[PDB]
Design an enzyme around this catalytic site. Structure first.
Site, PDB file in Angstrom:
ATOM      1  N   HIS A 114       0.808  -1.241   0.000  1.00  0.00           N
ATOM      2  CA  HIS A 114       0.000   0.000   0.000  1.00  0.00           C
ATOM      3  C   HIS A 114       0.827   1.270   0.000  1.00  0.00           C
ATOM      4  CE1 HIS A 114       0.599  -0.257   4.402  1.00  0.00           C
ATOM      5  NE2 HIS A 114       0.384   1.047   4.405  1.00  0.00           N
ATOM      6  N   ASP A 140       0.383  -7.908   1.488  1.00  0.00           N
ATOM      7  CA  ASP A 140       0.696  -6.478   1.493  1.00  0.00           C
ATOM      8  C   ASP A 140       2.216  -6.170   1.558  1.00  0.00           C
ATOM      9  OD1 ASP A 140       0.172  -3.684   1.432  1.00  0.00           O
ATOM     10  OD2 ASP A 140       0.157  -3.587   3.622  1.00  0.00           O
ATOM     11  N   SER A 152       4.104   1.007   9.601  1.00  0.00           N
ATOM     12  CA  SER A 152       3.743   0.183   8.472  1.00  0.00           C
ATOM     13  C   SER A 152       4.869   0.005   7.459  1.00  0.00           C
ATOM     14  CB  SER A 152       2.513   0.764   7.792  1.00  0.00           C
ATOM     15  OG  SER A 152       2.094  -0.081   6.745  1.00  0.00           O
TER      16      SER A 152
END
Lengths: 283, 281, 294
Positions: free
Chosen positions: B55, B85, B160
């Site tokens: 992402h 991801d 992240s």
């Protein structure tokens, strides 16, 4: 076996974390002293000096301090600092006071376990733990939340103004409710100490200003019209000697300036030695 | 006495965690590369490979990586995987690179202390502490966040794509926000390593797909004419053996199916079945 | 150099934490036991007694318990207690059960590291760590959240009714969702939970002794509720209690916890200021109004 525990830090430091109450006279219609705000504070030494958050004592008509051993005192405001959200109180200590353990030679490290001690009036003295996420800067030049100490210990309203200590019970910083989720901030103890001393001496924190930017050091933006303007300094050059010592980084140079007392004239390299008078950081 | 501390882990691992900037030309019009999305990544080895989240790099048009030591690099996207991801980047490794400590033999355990290291370009590199709540599977068959490693070490945007390490500084996983309150998810490092190599080799993760939801192994669904319907497979019969090995559990057989390349025919009576690449997402 | 870890506490305690399922016969529109409310519970001993939260088993048409090792059992509700939000379940397991480590002599300390173990059916068994922020009180006398054990271990739906253990895997308390709270969780101290469970096993409910006094070398009466064991006897308002049931009446709280422990109907001597008075203790006024403030 021995259960893992940080009880030693608690027993050593917790008695010096107090409840701070901001009370007002025009808060209710009958002009009776009433609680407007609550917070925590830290007794720094036996003379009765307590550090807390400026936002906790703002506009109070009466400041009351309550200790874990049951004693209650009225405190006097000696001064505050918006840039650090710190204030210093003074209680009239009779019979001795518990004081926070401090180790001025200890160097805080990212990853050190930390305990946040707060005396929320909603649930008694509380303690939470995390680690130091970023150490923050100790210089006097104001740069915002990113340079305060960061931690993942839960920091909230019943903590604010309270203490952040390592596993030995030594003061790492003063918890402060946010600035600038899941991360809290505190003023590094080294800066909190410098600020308290400045507030006791003068009744405010006096910082040295010069109006300059950059990142030798390249003068990126230096047109605040402050002192750097009313002297030899262009809006696009490179300074060398802050005064008499190398100007490595902009940050580590604004701190030297911050410590310089207003009215002082210093030699700013760029090699045309152009002298400038330091001002007192804007209101 | 010394203050309890996880600074050792920090010194060893944090230099290998970087900031990742997703720039974009068609950000607002001047047609100039404007920073669209920030993130973190982990430098995996001296060849210059970096693991971050898919992402973070979606629609980049230009990816930049900044190390804690100040160096800045342009990065090549070598591949990405939606199911986990993850995404792999590559930068110039010429001048030597700080690398994340990694022990392939280290068995992670629930209760292990871990540090989440994320490099957010808003409050700088942030380190948070927690423990492992669940170890998660390291197999290739996609299942969902539920089978990822779970931890209570604050996992957010400035984390992240960053690293999750133990107290020795060894990589336990890659922090990911979510994409199959109080708990964060990370891809176990053993799965991240397998994904990265497959992306380097093929440019995408190729997964085996049989299409037999065996909830012996009791089948339960083969409706989309999957490569199971096109072979000796019913709809509610068991599975005694697959590819010639035992058929103990279902999730250990699905990870096994996903590990054999598409096309191949293996024995699944016995109507030798043909595995076909997982359905494009 | 082995990594820092609490896995030992996990291996000893996690097996004893179970999933608890509350269903109802009229949940849907077909009249079938439909899983309504989930929760965690802790196996306290080999006989099969289990502690969980009252709110988790409330209005249950059938309670089922599932262990980590797979085994699944139907459970008997032996009783519950609103005041502490605890309930006790009983399952009959003949093949040996995993029980939570318990050490009645361990004294919990503020700052002790703790793990919160919750067995939710949404993410599997969850484990988080924190420390004890405040130890809490262990007497039967009602108090509210303020005196439960507090911890920064995160206490949510997938934890409630679960276990709070120290680094040795020993039970420190039973997780409970709030009471009377930002990033602060509450648990019923294990010493209290053990006393509660025993009383639930024996009586089916918790029976607390009541004397009718709110008095904050003696105790000072503050109030004397209407028609109470104290009201209906020598006691009005400013009387100084020297001792109850022939025991030094030092603290109001200690004395109230001592009264809670007395079986209703008992007749005890209450020395006031010299002036001995016989009081017949009653059952604690039945009321779920304690944590409302109303």
């Amino acid at each position: 076996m021995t259960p893992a525990s940080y009880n030693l830090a608690v027993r050593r430091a917790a008695p010096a974390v107090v409840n701070v109450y901001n009370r007002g006279l025009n808060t209710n219609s009958h002009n009776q002293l009433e609680i407007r705000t609550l917070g925590s504070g830290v007794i720094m030494d036996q003379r009765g000096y307590i550090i807390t958050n400026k936002h906790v004592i703002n506009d109070a008509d009466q400041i009351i301090v309550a200790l874990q051993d049951g004693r209650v005192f009225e405190a006097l405001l000696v001064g505050s600092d918006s840039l650090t959200d710190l204030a210093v109180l003074k209680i009239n200590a009779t019979g001795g006071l518990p004081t926070i353990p401090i180790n001025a030679r200890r160097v805080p490290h990212i990853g050190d376990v930390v305990l946040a001690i707060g005396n929320p009036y909603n649930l008694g003295q509380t303690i939470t733990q995390g680690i130091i996420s970023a150490t923050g800067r100790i210089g006097l030049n104001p740069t915002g939340r990113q340079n305060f100490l960061q931690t993942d210990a839960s920091i909230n309203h019943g903590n604010s103004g309270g203490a952040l200590v390592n596993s030995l019970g030594e003061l790492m910083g003063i918890n402060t409710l946010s600035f600038d989720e899941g991360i809290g901030f505190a003023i590094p103890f080294q800066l909190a100490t410098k600020i308290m001393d400045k507030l006791i001496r003068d009744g405010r924190v006096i910082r040295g200003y010069i109006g300059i930017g950059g990142r030798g050091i390249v003068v990126n933006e230096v047109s605040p019209d402050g002192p750097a303007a009313n002297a030899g300094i262009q809006v696009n050059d490179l300074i060398i000697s802050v005064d008499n010592k190398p100007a490595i980084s902009a940050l580590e140079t604004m701190d030297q300036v911050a410590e310089i007392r207003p009215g002082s004239v210093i030699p700013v390299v760029v090699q045309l030695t152009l002298q400038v008078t330091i001002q007192e950081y804007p209101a």
